[PDB]
Amino acid sequence: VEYRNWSKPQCQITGFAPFSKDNSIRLSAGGDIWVTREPYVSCDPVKCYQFALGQGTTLDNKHSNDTVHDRIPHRTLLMNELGVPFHLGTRQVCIAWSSSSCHDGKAWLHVCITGDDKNATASFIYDGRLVDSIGSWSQNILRTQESECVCINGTCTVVMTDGSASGRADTRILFIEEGKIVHISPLAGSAQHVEECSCYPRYPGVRCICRDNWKGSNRPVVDINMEDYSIDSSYVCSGLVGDTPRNDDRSSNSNCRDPNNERGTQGVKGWAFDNGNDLWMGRTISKDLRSGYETFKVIGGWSTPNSKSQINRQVIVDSDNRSGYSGIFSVEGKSCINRCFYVELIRGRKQETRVWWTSNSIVVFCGTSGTYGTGSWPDGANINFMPI
Numbered sequence: 001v002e003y004r005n006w007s008k009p010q011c012q013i014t015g016f017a018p019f020s021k022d023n024s025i026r027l028s029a030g031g032d033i034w035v036t037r038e039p040y041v042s043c044d045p046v047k048c049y050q051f052a053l054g055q056g057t058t059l060d061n062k063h064s065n066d067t068v069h070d071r072i073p074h075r076t077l078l079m080n081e082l083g084v085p086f087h088l089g090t091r092q093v094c095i096a097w098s099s100s101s102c103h104d105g106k107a108w109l110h111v112c113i114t115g116d117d118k119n120a121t122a123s124f125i126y127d128g129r130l131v132d133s134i135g136s137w138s139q140n141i142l143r144t145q146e147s148e149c150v151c152i153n154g155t156c157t158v159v160m161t162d163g164s165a166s167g168r169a170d171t172r173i174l175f176i177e178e179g180k181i182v183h184i185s186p187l188a189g190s191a192q193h194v195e196e197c198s199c200y201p202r203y204p205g206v207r208c209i210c211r212d213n214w215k216g217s218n219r220p221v222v223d224i225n226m227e228d229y230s231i232d233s234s235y236v237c238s239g240l241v242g243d244t245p246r247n248d249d250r251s252s253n254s255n256c257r258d259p260n261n262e263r264g265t266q267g268v269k270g271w272a273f274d275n276g277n278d279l280w281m282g283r284t285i286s287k288d289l290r291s292g293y294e295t296f297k298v299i300g301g302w303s304t305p306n307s308k309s310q311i312n313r314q315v316i317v318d319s320d321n322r323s324g325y326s327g328i329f330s331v332e333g334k335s336c337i338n339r340c341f342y343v344e345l346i347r348g349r350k351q352e353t354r355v356w357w358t359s360n361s362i363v364v365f366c367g368t369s370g371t372y373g374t375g376s377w378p379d380g381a382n383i384n385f386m387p388i
Ligand SMILES: *[C@@H]1O[C@H](CO)[C@@H](O[C@@H]2O[C@H](CO)[C@@H](O[C@@H]3O[C@H](CO[C@H]4O[C@H](CO)[C@@H](O)[C@H](O)[C@@H]4O)[C@@H](O)[C@H](O[C@H]4O[C@H](CO)[C@@H](O)[C@H](O)[C@@H]4O)[C@@H]3O)[C@H](O)[C@H]2NC(C)=O)[C@H](O)[C@H]1NC(C)=O
Pocket: 118, 119
């Protein structure tokens, strides 16, 4: 077996088609399913897997109480073949309250982060063994992507950040070969806050669309040159804008260079990808809450500042239903490399108070160059039937 180099043109896509759904919450009311959050999907050269950060407990378990908290020592990274829900036979790959995994064509790489907030540690697990580790450099919650990393020719990139959640932070891009950190580049360019990057290969580089939790409702971009380790960053040009909270398609802007300062605080992990001068993107339908989910193409959303000409829209989750994080994953086809995405459907505590736990399910779509129809695919569980 040889290393993945992802050197195939990006497939032309018409939109996205239904791919997978796990119905975990619906199943949690009549079975032993893990309580999770921050899921993602990634594929090796033969098949795809679904990942998620568990909460060290099943749902119909008193231990599910107050699982709104994000960082506890019992969080582990779960990994199952795409489509099989997180039941008791699931493998906990490592201890992690924040993670990222990707396959280089020869073996899996998992970057798992646990520990105290002020002194977390990230373990780099490659081919089943712990190969390296690094400690917090800013003493303030070392965190990573919450989606897949990408490898070209045997070198994998993962962006990480340590520092303020709503203030200046220290973001770096590590390069790792066979689990070993061979280089670290600090962030450069004009992005002001970078978190939860959704990266994809763009031979010979890697491009990431991230979360600005400080000053922007528009999304930062991070360009990584695999050849010399040089970084560059900006914000997506699209005047449509993909963070939540955000302004209003009417009063939202982006100049491609700086955080727009329009309801900048907070956000949600999301994605987007360029296609010539256009941009394919996805976001919650609601501008205030993590509700509904839609995707569309923005004519010129990549190259022209504040472009708002939308086309090819699709509703993935109707606006009366809950959504959450979303990220991207790439899959190698016979002649081109395709782009797909998953969307986390959060249920429970925070918005829903009948129960005491917080967990999620997922639904995933893959681009298509063919035809498609219409629909809506939400979680599906009736909160009134749920335990707790
Ligand atoms: C973030 O995480 C890191 C990594 O885990 C922590 O660093 C470790 O901190 C511990 C505690 O200080 C270190 O272990 C201790 O080493 C001491 C020796 O080092 C000092 O003294 C020698 C003297 O020759 C100097 O050369 C050296 O420079 C140091 O000044 C031991 O004496 C310690 O044992 C004694 O104290 C402990 C409690 O601390 C008692 O329980 C023991 O009984 C004993 O009395 C201990 O072995 C460790 O070496 C550090 N690791 C590294 C790699 O540096 C950070 O502290 C942590 N930061 C925060 C804020 O949490």
